[PDB]
Ligand binder design. Structure first.
Ligand code: FBP
Ligand code: FBP
Ligand code: FBP
Lengths: 529, 529, 532
């Protein structure tokens, strides 16, 4: 390091947690972390924002995008087709409003989140108080579908009496209320309230440690997916995936016409956790859906499942998302808690490709500030990653490969470490080439230049890929068309402030048109032309 | 491992995250973590609970102690001597209520938390609304000491006009309200409200990135410390330590008569962080006081300072405490958020010796449940620690030593790993011998048998030390007195459920009476006598 | 390593590939396998000393086929014209193969300096009179020139004048392969009053060593100044500078090679304790190092030499400069067809230690099996090269090497990392000076670094760097520079194909630059070997 410190300035090595990057143990790494060491890199951890009343206006979205939202989540657990279709128009209006200047345009992906195997309570309307210590009944009786009170809950899962056990829990409304079952019979269940809040009407029920007969996709889901194809969505977040076949069902539904759509299976319960490896293998990636997961399993165990699934997805090289209550208190407050700040940082340090806002952006008072807070924590945490260890462990775990794109990608990432490259610039049609760079977690941003609008959107799922959408039509000479895409990477980089004159860039390209021929790594100096 | 699996049962190696313990990389470690793998060990991370209205009754304390409170924190920022003196009696009444049965008696330490260099607002009384966008004034004018409104704040730091800068912040009431200074003059400051809540009367002010002339100990502090000596407290949490001399001031105050009291310096601001190494060297340990720290420094950087200080304290072998908002939402709610759960786990995985509750126990609706939730997260996180790496890194970092107690301690911890010892049993007068075991972070509990009531209390600061207070008077033959203290460790272990017949224990003792002669490690089977 | 399905079960049996996949060095050792056959590409260079048994053009030709890469001219013996006869003989043997330039093996020529000598005077006149000395004795070492010929059993004179000053009371005086030791007792005006320790027979003008003494001689005799200038005249690739002791001795050789010899590669020979102590400063200003174990194992205890060897190979590996292991590697083979079990072991362990080259002295120069010596070193080195634990070596070198903004450095480590991901048969590099190939060498890839060059000198000099197989390209530039680049690469690959280094469906990493002239290497491509 003594020589770049005479060339790049003493202060270059004070930023990006570079003193901590050069440590020889994880422990020493931790000791050298410095609050005055400023993140300089662009932010690599994608932000996912749930659209709802607080974030659906075209002007709201424009501020979200400016703040750093990369992916928009449509939760089909609430709202009609036309409501969502309008969310989509407003998002594409906001996004496409920056097309004016191609060099600074930010692709925004749109993720459709399924309703999935849901269990709802009755019309019970307004609201009624439920009391801890107190005896509540659960019935499947179609007459009570319309009645309901502090003493009786109806629920639309007919066979509930066949699946629970004595001492098992029934949780209603995102786990707000807890009932312990004491007696099972064919008429219904007899329950004591363990946790008593105020019950609304047609709420969500969870039954931990049960096998519920509800099939892969409800009729409602089949429809919701065909909407997504019709509206050209980029990603499905598949709710409550329990086994592989559940993911295959989803793929079949999307059929030939939506085979390029990414399936992110949400692990929400003990079944998904247990069947995780088989879910991973057929999904495009994973969401640690900590909300359902923290009622389906004991709450003090969610961190184990989080770190497990993130690790296995890092090892598999498929994107993984951390979700739910990351900045919960910013629903009502403008500044998050010390534990929220911690949780966002620890999700990045764990190895998450994406972090997610729900309430915070859908309904809260501070949607834009939440996005801004995730963006600011993420940048700090990314630079505090111990790349030495991480890269070496990924290097080792990864199999040998005779695939030129794999070979090229690992040489390029190594190269970027050797010189502290400001960027790896890569041409990709499908995103694949950038993904294989991303899977080694380089410090250097992976600037992916593509003509596929859809690719530019989907690559937000892979940590460290900055998609640039290329709009100009083919030069006549292919080699020229290549240079210009590369030159567009650089100029965009310059304008967006990720690259400056004198920076080194690694440039990854291929020897002919089409997917699958990336085979070339160059080392260039950014220049003034 | 194939042989203990034929001896101890296949299922022994399914618990304590033992499959993950046997992994060869950190990454693989993470992948093997298992939500069905049950923590079996006792909980090693001490819990600190702030005493206040919700946790001051003798009956409340008894449930706190049962739930797992190890250290009681008296916050001298609120309350009079007689109020606190009564907190102390109630704590000692609760604690000493279990002396009935020596084999299950749990020492409870009492920590005195200083008021420290405080800056307070005026009598302003009741409450008044302060508004974002709006022009507020700060004055030192003794006339306004009694007035105050949505347009004027008084504050008792006379020289405030001499220490701030334009664009600097003034934060009032645990950072509830934020003012940006725009004009400085000798009469006062002119400020815009950035963050507007509701102001009370005589609240706390923070001035980030300023040097305030306020001396080491205020007059009030001198007194508060002499109370602590008089009331036999175990620990000082020294508020807002800024430099070493601040810690020496505290030690001088306690004078000869309180030289065995432990000083834990609270790092709350950019000055303490910068001067951390020199603070550590003279303190007995550290508190990451994330509350003040998250307003004194940018909030998105607290995790860097946390992980830094925890690492440096692990490396130094001195206790370190993580504090503030760990389970904040349990002030009003019975179940914490997914990020609170995360934060507690990540503080244990970071290497914290102690975790802390404030609001959650002092004033909230759910004091006992908060303690129970910290206890349950901590147990899970402790077993998910990657001991392979951690022990090796501590082994390496630690200097060579010709001190027999150091030598013995590292052999013993190695030994405990070889056999998955249920416990290391150690005789200590002062606690030192158990501390040097603790500093290598064994999986096996360090059961410390002592006659010093005060030691039994203070060793709660060191991760993994379970103090047992020994009450029987000296056998005539010293060797016999040793065996019996050791036999008391075992029986206590048996009764409390940390040891069973057939378990291996490492037993650490010394060759003569007095501190400093620990030099002996034995390997024993727990027996039926 | 599940890919096995495409390259065959067979592939992961060979090259010590199971031992390469071990997580620990101990597991690595455990998985070493005598049935796991090595590749043809042998990456550690053989320096053969040229003397009586290795001068015949027929023998040189055999020695080249056996796998000799550098030819050492020991200028301690032989005449200028003797040597020019050797040089011309070598060139003839080398150039006899230029006829098929796809299998042409460049052969470097190294000039081994005579350097600071210290000789004993004549014994009572006669040049074959052989005194004896008794152990518990008294002996005298003199400056005085009349004793030159008056050489008693009690008194001897020696070339080196300034011993009075430089050897102190207690210093040791070894004579003839350290057969005779003297502990210096008194620094008299007479000379040095010594006490014998070991004894035996004598002669006149036989080597003497000054253990732990800082030799006064300038580090270039007049004979060196003259041998060097001859070296420049005959276009030698490499100097082995004898008895290097400090940095100034290396600069003295660079000074004496002058502007005409700027591109001669200087390998400082570490022969003595002062050498070992000043090693780092010597290494800063040299292009490499010889571990000259002959003289070293007299000038320091024999049991300490493996320590000096291992330290110097490690420090050179760290610096990324070649290092030679020299002396008695196959001693027995002078007289016998086959080596001892300690000799093969010594060769394998030099390679596992990290030696860029291994040397044969008498085994090739004056001995009865020079061709089979070469063949032995060649066979052991291929087996030992595969038993290297690259996972740990590559990891340590990576971590030890500094960050660089030099695109050649950057490209190189990228290429080496790529080679490892896919078990590349080769890294094909274009280089004018050798530098681009050396910068690959430094990371010790398992794949052969096939260096394509038009520089005949570079192609020869590059044998110093482990794993670099030089090819000489003769064709004149194509019209279009890009077509000229591609033709060199193709030469590289077809050259490989002919020699067995490469087979169709192998991956290669191809390293090249963006424009002509040195220092512009900046491109790495992954390609398949073609013409299925
Ligand atoms: O990442 P993917 O989808 O394989 O795309 C990589 C491809 O992009 C290119 O660089 C350029 O291809 P196009 O000119 O066909 O867009 C190819 O050379 C390479 O194979
Ligand atoms: O941990 P410390 O304070 O050094 O105490 C260790 C001491 O305790 C003992 O085991 C027993 O000492 P006492 O019998 O004096 O309590 C000593 O042998 C040993 O030196
Ligand atoms: O190894 P060196 O001395 O830097 O030589 C490397 C040079 O070889 C090349 O591949 C070809 O250059 P030439 O055509 O000058 O031989 C250059 O692009 C590159 O800079």
């Amino acid at each position: 390091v003594a020589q770049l410190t005479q060339e790049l300035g003493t202060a270059f090595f004070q930023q990006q947690q570079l003193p901590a990057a050069m440590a020889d143990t994880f422990l020493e790494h931790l000791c050298l972390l410095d609050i005055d060491s400023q993140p300089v890199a662009a932010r690599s951890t994608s932000i996912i924002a749930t659209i709802g009343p607080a974030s659906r206006s075209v002007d709201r979205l424009k501020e979200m995008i400016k703040a750093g939202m990369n992916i928009a989540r449509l939760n089909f657990s609430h709202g009609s087709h036309e409501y969502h279709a309008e969310s989509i128009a407003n998002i594409r209006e906001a996004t496409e409003s920056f097309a004016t200047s191609p060099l600074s345009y930010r692709p925004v992906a749109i993720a459709l989140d399924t309703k999935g195997p849901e269990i709802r309570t009755g019309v019970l309307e307004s609201e009624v108080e439920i009391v801890k210590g107190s005896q509540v009944l659960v019935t499947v009786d179609p007459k009570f579908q319309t009645r309901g009170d502090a003493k009786t809950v109806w629920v639309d899962y007919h066979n509930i009496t066949r699946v629970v056990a004595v001492g098992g829990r029934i949780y209603i409304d995102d786990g707000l209320i807890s009932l312990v079952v004491q007696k099972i019979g064919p008429e219904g269940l007899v329950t004591e309230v363990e946790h008593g809040g105020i019950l609304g009407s047609r709420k969500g029920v969870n039954l931990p440690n049960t096998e519920v007969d509800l099939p892969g996709l409800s009729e409602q889901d089949l429809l919701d997916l065909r909407f997504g194809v019709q509206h050209n969505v980029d990603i499905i977040f598949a709710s409550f995936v329990r086994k592989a076949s559940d993911v295959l069902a989803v793929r079949d539904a999307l059929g030939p016409e939506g085979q390029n759509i990414k399936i992110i299976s949400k692990i929400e319960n003990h079944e998904g956790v247990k069947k995780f490896d088989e879910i991973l293998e057929v999904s495009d990636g994973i969401m640690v859906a900590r909300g359902d997961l923290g009622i389906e399993i004991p709450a003090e165990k969610v961190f184990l499942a989080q770190k497990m699934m993130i690790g296995r997805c890092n090892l598999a090289g498929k994107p993984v998302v951390c979700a739910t209550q990351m900045l919960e208190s910013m629903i009502t407050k403008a500044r998050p808690t010390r534990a929220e700040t911690s949780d966002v940082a620890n999700a990045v340090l764990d190895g998450a490709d994406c972090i997610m806002l729900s309430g915070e952006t859908a309904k809260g008072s501070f949607p834009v500030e939440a996005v801004m807070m995730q963006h600011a924590i993420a940048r700090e945490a990314e630079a505090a990653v111990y790349h030495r260890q991480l890269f070496e462990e990924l290097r080792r775990a990864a199999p040998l490969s005779r695939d030129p794109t794999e070979v090229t990608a690992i040489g390029a990432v190594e190269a970027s470490f050797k010189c502290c490259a400001a960027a790896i610039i890569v041409l990709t049609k499908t995103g694949r080439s950038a993904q294989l760079l991303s899977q080694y977690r380089p410090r250097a941003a992976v600037i992916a230049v593509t003509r596929s609008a859809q690719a530019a959107r989907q690559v937000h799922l892979s940590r460290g890929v900055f998609p640039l959408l290329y709009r100009e039509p083919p030069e006549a000479i292919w080699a020229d068309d290549v240079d210009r895409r590369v030159q567009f990477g650089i100029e965009s980089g310059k304008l967006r402030g990720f690259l400056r004159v004198g920076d080194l860039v690694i440039v990854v390209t291929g020897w002919r048109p089409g997917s699958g021929y990336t085979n070339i790594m160059r080392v260039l100096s950014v220049s003034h032309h």
